[PDB]
Amino acid sequence: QVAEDCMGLLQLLSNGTVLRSNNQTVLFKDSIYHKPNNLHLRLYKPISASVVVFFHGGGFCFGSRSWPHFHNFCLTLASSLNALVVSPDYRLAPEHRLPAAFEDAEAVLTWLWDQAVSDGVNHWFEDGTDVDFDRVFVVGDSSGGNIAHQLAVRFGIELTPVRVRGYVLMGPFFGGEERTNSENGPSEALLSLDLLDKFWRLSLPNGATRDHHMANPFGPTSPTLESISLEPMLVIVGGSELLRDRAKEYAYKLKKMGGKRVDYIEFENKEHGFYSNYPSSEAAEQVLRIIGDFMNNLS
Amino acid sequence: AEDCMGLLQLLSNGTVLRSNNQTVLFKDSIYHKPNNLHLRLYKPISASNRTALPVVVFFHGGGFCFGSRSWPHFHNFCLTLASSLNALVVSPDYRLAPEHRLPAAFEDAEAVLTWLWDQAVSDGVNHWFEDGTDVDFDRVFVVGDSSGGNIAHQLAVRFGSGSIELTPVRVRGYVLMGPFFGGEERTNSENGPSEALLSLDLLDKFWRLSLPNGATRDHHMANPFGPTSPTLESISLEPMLVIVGGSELLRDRAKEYAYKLKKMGGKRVDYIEFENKEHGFYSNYPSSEAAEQVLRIIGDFMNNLS
């Protein structure tokens, strides 16, 4: 008996088996980063070149570096930012429930450090400029945003050769039992309250609640943020998103808490993933515009 | 350090870089969480509740260093198998060299079988594709392309790790399609004209990336006949079927193979050669006379073994 059914593409059974179902620049190739679980990431280098870790979305239950509009976005950041993109796959729920994805995220960083301490052996594209941007900037779409937060909070000097500078949080997938105002009311194209709940049910540990940490940063079990020092962040949200106020309430709290540098930008009437979905739309290039600044002012 | 066709680059430091026939419904699932390995199931739509369907585990090729269940002609082949054989097809991914050297792939192969047993017992049968369908786990058949053939040789449940008699699921036959076998001494075919696809140096490459560091081509995981490999006479083997192309560089290897098993006591081994054909002619050139023939022997091979 289907215990859970995510749009038909994911079927978690009662017993628990889980069933499943435009121009060109830049250059890209793939590699392993974690052998015991066989996890691979992809590198993008703009070719026009003379690091941006992208964690893809999918509410922790869908997504792959190979996916089209995930890939399409990765080329766009790479080219226009003149940037090396690191787009890893992370383990997916319900087969791999949280904190699986977060553990894998930390593994991505470790791989970068181990490639950096390699005595700068390009080991990616030898025809290359040593560390176009040693400065690294995490960018998280949907669920990917949640990883970026957990990666700030975790690294409050670990992996010294590599220094996270900024955190881009793009429609971050945050949780909580109390809906606020965006969740209630109008379901988006593709995004409905029950669907966001589903994502959580499949993602978080069995028996957990939406206010569990790794979902709500301000849940009872979640840690205190004021003490911990954060790196400068950037939250981008669509006006029509169901996670609009979640990311506002988030940003609101961080900025009002002291010391943390958090910028917040809304795009009016846009739905989740207007970036890396309908690219080359004015809104998209604007996102490009802001992240560039976010990084050059964070240089 | 090594460069397979440009698509795979094993560097000096451990570092590896890379680059609608219908009639059947299909979907994917996990079978091994610790290694995060996925397989695909194919179930015929022509099924009008005919009988209990047999199982066909298809291990894809790629010389243990390439391949995926999602790949086009691998996927296409699995669809043809299911349709023509009226059978459940199980197309798993196995770990790939040089990142995962052997026996990684063989261990993963065993995990597929154990998984299907956990999907024979504990129901699961038909909970996959709700279409009313009976699954005859008593009639299982392994099918191996290229490297997949090598997988098929091992995993002969007896020749395998203990034979865990996975009752109710029971393998009946093993189809070995241009099996990727090894050995230091070359035989005529290896030394003749390299194919459009397969070249002698390329097969050496495949082996170099695949087998454990320092090992030789006569390692039991490449050569089934010595020095370290088992006797084979002692262990009782299931009936097998070897298919090879006339022009293949592993023509004599699989013939020498078939010759030897067949020359042993009891073992049932059939051998079929397709004249002037290259490796993977069944996959690369489907709906060809040769291909459609291939699906007619495997059918008979299954129905005689049913």
Q: Which residue of B has its CA nearest to A13?
A: B127
Instruction: Write the CATH number for B168.
Output: 3.40.50.1820
C-alpha span between A296 and A286 (Å, rounded): 16
Peptide bond into B168 cis (omega under 30): yes
Query: Residues B232, B264: contact at Cβ < 8 Å?
Result: yes
Say how many domains are in chain B.
1
Peptide bond into B227 cis (omega under 30): yes
- Token pair 């451990």 in the structure block, residue: B14
Active-site annotation holder among B91, B146, B210, B247: B146
Measured in angstroms, the resolution is: 3.1
Peptide bond into B103 cis (omega under 30): yes
| Alpha-carbon separation of residue A209 from A31, A94, A150, A224 (angstroms) | 36, 15, 18, 19
Got the DSSP string for B170-236? Answer: -EEEEEEES-----SS--HHHHS---SS--HHHHHHHHHHHSPTT--TTSTTT-SSSSSS--SSSS-
The alpha-carbon gap from B124 to the nearest alpha carbon of chain A, in Å, equals 8
Structural domain including B127 reads 2-304
Q: Which helix (H) or strand (E) holds A12?
A: strand A10-13
| Alpha-carbon separation of residue B246 from B119, B189, B271 (angstroms) | 39, 9, 12
The method of structure determination was X-ray
Determine how β-strand B37-44 pairs with β-strand B269-274: unpaired
Q: A9 CB near a chain B CB, below 8 Å?
A: no
C-alpha span between A82 and A75 (Å, rounded): 10
Active-site annotation holder among B32, B60, B153, B279: B279
The alpha-carbon gap from A107 to the nearest alpha carbon of chain B, in Å, equals 15
Report CA Rg, chain B: 18
Q: B35 CB near a chain A CB, below 8 Å?
A: yes
Got the DSSP string for B219-242? Answer: STTT-SSSSSS--SSSS----EEE
DSSP code of B154?
Answer: B
The alpha-carbon gap from B18 to the nearest alpha carbon of chain A, in Å, equals 5
Going by C-alpha positions, the residue among B189, B216, B79, B53 that lies closest to residue B132 is B53
Cα end-to-end span (Å), chain A: 53
| Alpha-carbon separation of residue B71 from B36, B77, B93, B220, B288 (angstroms) | 18, 10, 10, 29, 20
Residues of B in contact with A36 (CB under 8 A): 34-35
Q: Do B123 and A20 touch (CB under 8 A)?
A: no
Residue type, A48: S
Quickly count: other Cβ atoms within 10 Å of residue B245's Cβ.
24
DSSP code of A210?
Answer: T
Phi, psi of A230 (to 5 degrees): -105, 155
Query: Residues A2, A8: contact at Cβ < 8 Å?
Result: no
Going by C-alpha positions, the residue among B79, B145, B146, B155 that lies closest to residue B116 is B155
**Inter-chain CB pairs, A–B, below 8 Å:** 64
Peptide bond into B98 cis (omega under 30): yes
B10, B17, B40, B75: best to mutate for the A interface, most A CBs within 10 A? B17
Determine how β-strand B16-18 pairs with β-strand A27-34: antiparallel
* B273 CB burial (10 A radius; 0-12, 13-18, 19+): middle
